[PDB]
Design a protein around this ligand. Structure first.
Ligand SMILES: Fc1ccc([P+](c2ccc(F)cc2)(c2ccc(F)cc2)c2ccc(F)cc2)cc1
Lengths: 102, 102
């Protein structure tokens, strides 16, 4: 499967893997995050080799923000109106404006 | 704290070490650059002791669009246009809100 899509997934899944309980979690290796970083950085290296570097990083932030925010709101029941999220919206709107001119 | 700035900075320092260290007669070993990358992930783990994952990500993304812009531009060009100034200012405003959280 495609390197860039794998790289986008690697962070979204990786952070979701880090967000596990202090209790017991099924199927979680304690070396898992360290493996996920090694996998993520290998995928990134392939991604930057074979796609234009500015394009790849602009797409990676762009998809990743929408995907984590939709996943977190939709299936983990999280709030979009909390103080930090309100500041984050301005960053994400500003990021879109620069990306439209790129 | 200085952990979040340090974690972002370690990725930039490691990138700078990687870009500088072309050739193989050079004194510096690739492992030293790997230690700078290992440090960034460890500094992120220190960051996530008292900071939520999304809040840390939003600040990293706010700097990240500037990192994309420097990568896209290389050398600096002429002064920014009105929508670009607004988009950059919205990123500035979001960081100002996030850093004024108690
Ligand atoms: F050109 C680039 C583009 C992206 C990165 P990235 C990244 C890429 C792919 C992935 F699957 C997970 C993380 C990163 C951050 C600290 C490091 F030590 C190594 C990589 C990263 C993480 C969070 C963020 F908000 C922005 C970038 C580095 C250089």
């Amino acid at each position: 499967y495609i390197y860039l899509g794998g790289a986008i997934l690697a962070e979204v899944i990786g952070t979701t893997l880090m967000k596990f309980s202090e209790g017991f979690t099924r199927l979680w290796p304690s070396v898992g995050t360290i493996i996920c970083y090694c996998a993520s950085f290998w995928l990134l290296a392939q991604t930057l080799a074979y796609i234009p570097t500015g394009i790849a990083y602009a797409i990676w932030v762009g998809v990743g923000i929408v995907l984590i925010s939709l996943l977190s709101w939709g299936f983990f029941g999280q709030r979009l109106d909390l103080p930090a999220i309100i500041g984050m919206m301005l960053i994400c709107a500003g990021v879109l404006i620069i990306n439209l001119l790129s």
